Design an enzyme around this catalytic site. Structure first.
Site, PDB file in Angstrom:
ATOM      1  N   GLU A   1      -6.269   6.206  -2.456  1.00 15.88           N
ATOM      2  CA  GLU A   1      -6.390   5.273  -1.489  1.00 15.88           C
ATOM      3  C   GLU A   1      -6.796   3.906  -2.118  1.00 15.88           C
ATOM      4  OE1 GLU A   1      -5.650   4.382   1.795  1.00 15.88           O
ATOM      5  OE2 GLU A   1      -4.357   6.293   1.324  1.00 15.88           O
TER       6      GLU A   1
ATOM      7  N   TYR B   1      -4.296  14.196  -2.950  1.00 18.21           N
ATOM      8  CA  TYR B   1      -4.723  13.533  -1.729  1.00 18.21           C
ATOM      9  C   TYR B   1      -6.011  14.437  -0.996  1.00 18.21           C
ATOM     10  CZ  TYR B   1      -4.003   9.940   1.779  1.00 18.21           C
ATOM     11  OH  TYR B   1      -4.054   8.676   2.471  1.00 18.21           O
TER      12      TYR B   1
ATOM     13  N   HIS C   1       1.616   4.322  -3.180  1.00 20.24           N
ATOM     14  CA  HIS C   1       1.427   5.637  -2.964  1.00 20.24           C
ATOM     15  C   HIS C   1       2.744   6.295  -3.660  1.00 20.24           C
ATOM     16  CE1 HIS C   1      -1.795   6.340  -0.408  1.00 20.24           C
ATOM     17  NE2 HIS C   1      -1.603   5.527   0.764  1.00 20.24           N
TER      18      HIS C   1
ATOM     19  N   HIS D   1       0.751  -1.186   0.061  1.00 23.82           N
ATOM     20  CA  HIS D   1       0.038   0.066   0.083  1.00 23.82           C
ATOM     21  C   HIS D   1       0.936   1.334  -0.058  1.00 23.82           C
ATOM     22  CE1 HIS D   1      -3.748   2.290   1.526  1.00 23.82           C
ATOM     23  NE2 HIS D   1      -2.761   3.116   1.853  1.00 23.82           N
ATOM     24  N   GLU D   2       1.948   1.200   0.990  1.00 25.02           N
ATOM     25  CA  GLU D   2       2.776   2.261   1.026  1.00 25.02           C
ATOM     26  C   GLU D   2       3.513   2.473  -0.221  1.00 25.02           C
ATOM     27  OE1 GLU D   2       1.611   4.100   3.377  1.00 25.02           O
ATOM     28  OE2 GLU D   2       0.650   2.696   4.206  1.00 25.02           O
TER      29      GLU D   2
ATOM     30  N   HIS E   1     -10.102   7.722   2.953  1.00 27.79           N
ATOM     31  CA  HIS E   1      -9.917   6.325   3.538  1.00 27.79           C
ATOM     32  C   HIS E   1     -11.133   5.599   3.520  1.00 27.79           C
ATOM     33  CE1 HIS E   1      -6.090   7.727   4.758  1.00 27.79           C
ATOM     34  NE2 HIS E   1      -5.675   6.464   4.620  1.00 27.79           N
TER      35      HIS E   1
ATOM     36  N   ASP F   1     -10.522  13.383   7.297  1.00 30.26           N
ATOM     37  CA  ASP F   1      -9.781  12.345   6.542  1.00 30.26           C
ATOM     38  C   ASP F   1      -9.510  13.190   5.379  1.00 30.26           C
ATOM     39  OD1 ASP F   1      -8.645   9.883   5.918  1.00 30.26           O
ATOM     40  OD2 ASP F   1     -10.541   9.028   5.219  1.00 30.26           O
TER      41      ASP F   1
HETATM   42  C1  5H8 Z   1      -2.365   0.418   5.129  1.00 27.33           C
HETATM   43  C2  5H8 Z   1      -2.873   1.068   6.414  1.00 27.33           C
HETATM   44  C3  5H8 Z   1      -2.324   0.089   7.690  1.00 27.33           C
HETATM   45  C4  5H8 Z   1      -2.011   2.328   6.453  1.00 27.33           C
HETATM   46  C5  5H8 Z   1      -2.602   3.498   5.739  1.00 27.33           C
HETATM   47  N1  5H8 Z   1      -1.666   4.778   5.847  1.00 27.33           N
HETATM   48  P1  5H8 Z   1      -1.676   5.979   4.664  1.00 27.33           P
HETATM   49  O1  5H8 Z   1      -0.506   5.700   3.618  1.00 27.33           O
HETATM   50  O2  5H8 Z   1      -2.743   5.854   3.763  1.00 27.33           O
HETATM   51  C6  5H8 Z   1      -1.447   7.359   5.583  1.00 27.33           C
HETATM   52  N2  5H8 Z   1      -0.933   8.540   4.673  1.00 27.33           N
HETATM   53  C7  5H8 Z   1      -1.646   9.910   4.922  1.00 27.33           C
HETATM   54  O3  5H8 Z   1      -2.206  10.130   5.830  1.00 27.33           O
HETATM   55  O4  5H8 Z   1      -1.140  10.907   4.109  1.00 27.33           O
HETATM   56  C8  5H8 Z   1      -0.713  12.028   4.633  1.00 27.33           C
HETATM   57  C9  5H8 Z   1       0.456  12.626   4.060  1.00 27.33           C
HETATM   58  C10 5H8 Z   1       0.583  13.102   2.929  1.00 27.33           C
HETATM   59  C11 5H8 Z   1       1.855  13.650   2.554  1.00 27.33           C
HETATM   60  C12 5H8 Z   1       2.908  13.283   3.202  1.00 27.33           C
HETATM   61  C13 5H8 Z   1       2.984  12.636   4.299  1.00 27.33           C
HETATM   62  C14 5H8 Z   1       1.699  12.055   4.805  1.00 27.33           C
HETATM   63  C15 5H8 Z   1      -3.822   3.772   6.067  1.00 27.33           C
HETATM   64  O5  5H8 Z   1      -4.839   3.444   5.388  1.00 27.33           O
HETATM   65  N3  5H8 Z   1      -3.882   4.476   7.424  1.00 27.33           N
HETATM   66  C16 5H8 Z   1      -5.175   5.033   7.837  1.00 27.33           C
HETATM   67  C17 5H8 Z   1      -5.436   6.452   8.013  1.00 27.33           C
HETATM   68  O6  5H8 Z   1      -4.326   7.076   7.988  1.00 27.33           O
HETATM   69  O7  5H8 Z   1      -6.476   6.972   8.065  1.00 27.33           O
HETATM   70  C18 5H8 Z   1      -5.219   4.089   9.233  1.00 27.33           C
HETATM   71  C19 5H8 Z   1      -4.284   4.445  10.349  1.00 27.33           C
HETATM   72  C20 5H8 Z   1      -5.341   2.845   8.950  1.00 27.33           C
HETATM   73  C21 5H8 Z   1      -6.835   4.417   9.949  1.00 27.33           C
HETATM   74 ZN    ZN Z   2      -2.841   5.060   2.027  1.00 31.39          ZN
END
Ligand code: 5H8
Ligand code: ZN
Ligand code: CA
Ligand code: CA
Ligand code: CA
Ligand code: CA
Length: 316
Positions: free
Chosen positions: A166, A157, A146, A142-143, A231, A226
């Site tokens: 996402e 985003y 991105h 997933h990461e 998400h 969000d």
């Molecule tokens: C697969 C899962 C385990 C992890 C996943 N992380 P992401 O890469 O989507 C989080 N990225 C994010 O917020 O981008 C912000 C940004 C933008 C630019 C630079 C730096 C940061 C997720 O689904 N996270 C959820 C959430 O953050 O809402 C969560 C905690 C599971 C509820």
């Molecule tokens: Zn993500």
């Protein structure tokens, strides 16, 4: 660093033994020279300064509890690299074998992972909501996805483009999980979420509504949390993808499944040839239809099934 390629051994977050590609120069570093211009894993040491220090080990054995998140971040980045190269003929996230960097032990009790514009970052979790997040192959993929998105479509985003962003990461996270073929499913993060509760996950692609996420455009979130629900509304697209692959009847609309490999080809082509930074759900449908047309023909089952799936989730 400059050194010679070596092969270490260790245990990941879930206690499984695996070999990892390292580099020797006084210490054994988590630097895999076998893939592109390298995969590099760093220790953030419970702080938030990035990347931290390139992971150094005295004996090339990685069996300590502290080592486990690094072993998995490193190994699963390799699997993800292999998926993109072998399945899509893509060399790293930029298509030109960019070095892949990850940091683990980010912050304290950190219940998340992210791509920061330049590298992957993994928390250890608080032990209740999450265990160290690199333990999930779908999470690692997933990461890294991105990064692929940012270098290609560049989906902004927020709002619908952000929900597509996402979903792309959940889709390829899942396809990488199937590629590795260890306990694959259409759930997200099940291997690292809630160690005290069995059978749950962060999101479900097969039934987004099981965790309160929408599975139809009429149920989309339109508030500001969000980043406008990136998400949350991803569930609408995840459901479409799941239906394209596996089939089903959803709100009375039947979809003939065409399988994971064709799902991946269609969405990879959409991502890299048709989507733009501001694409909305309707534009994603058009991009997927066109991609399927390119690959399989306008009269194909594959095109018909893409249309059925987007119909089923209310996206025209
Ligand atoms: C697969 C899962 C385990 C992890 C996943 N992380 P992401 O890469 O989507 C989080 N990225 C994010 O917020 O981008 C912000 C940004 C933008 C630019 C630079 C730096 C940061 C997720 O689904 N996270 C959820 C959430 O953050 O809402 C969560 C905690 C599971 C509820
Ligand atoms: Zn993500
Ligand atoms: Ca050691
Ligand atoms: Ca699984
Ligand atoms: Ca999964
Ligand atoms: Ca759980």
């Amino acid at each position: 660093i400059t050194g010679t390629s070596t092969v270490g051994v260790g245990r990941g977050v879930l206690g499984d033994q695996k070999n990892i590609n390292t580099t020797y120069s006084t210490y054994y570093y988590l630097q895999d020279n076998t893939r592109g211009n390298g995969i590099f894993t760093y220790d953030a040491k419970y702080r938030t300064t990035l990347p931290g220090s390139l992971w150094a080990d005295a004996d090339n054995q990685f069996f300590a509890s502290y080592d486990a998140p690094a072993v998995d971040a490193h190994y699963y980045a390799g699997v993800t690299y292999d998926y993109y190269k072998n399945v899509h003929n893509r060399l790293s996230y930029d298509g030109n074998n960019a070095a892949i960097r990850s940091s683990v032990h980010y912050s304290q009790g950190y219940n998340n992972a992210f791509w920061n514009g330049s590298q992957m970052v993994y928390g250890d979790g608080d032990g209740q909501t999450f265990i160290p997040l690199s333990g999930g192959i779908d999470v690692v993929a997933h990461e890294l996805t991105h990064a692929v998105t940012d270098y290609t479509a560049g989906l902004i985003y927020q709002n619908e483009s952000g929900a597509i962003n996402e979903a792309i990461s959940d889709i390829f996270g899942t396809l990488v999980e199937f590629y590795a073929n260890k306990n694959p499913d259409w759930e997200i993060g099940e291997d690292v979420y809630t160690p005290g509760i069995s059978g749950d996950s962060l999101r479900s692609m097969s039934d987004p509504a099981k965790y309160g996420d929408p599975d139809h455009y009429s149920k989309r979130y339109t508030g500001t949390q969000d980043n406008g629900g990136v998400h949350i509304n991803s569930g609408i697209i995840n459901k479409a993808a799941y239906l394209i692959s596996q089939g089903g009847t959803h709100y009375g609309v039947s979809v003939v499944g065409i399988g994971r490999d064709k799902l991946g080809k269609i969405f990879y082509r959409a991502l890299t040839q048709y989507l733009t930074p501001t694409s909305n759900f309707s534009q994603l449908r058009a991009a997927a239809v066109q991609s399927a047309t390119d690959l399989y023909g306008s009269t194909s089952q594959e095109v018909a099934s893409v249309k059925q799936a987007f119909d089923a989730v209310g996206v025209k």
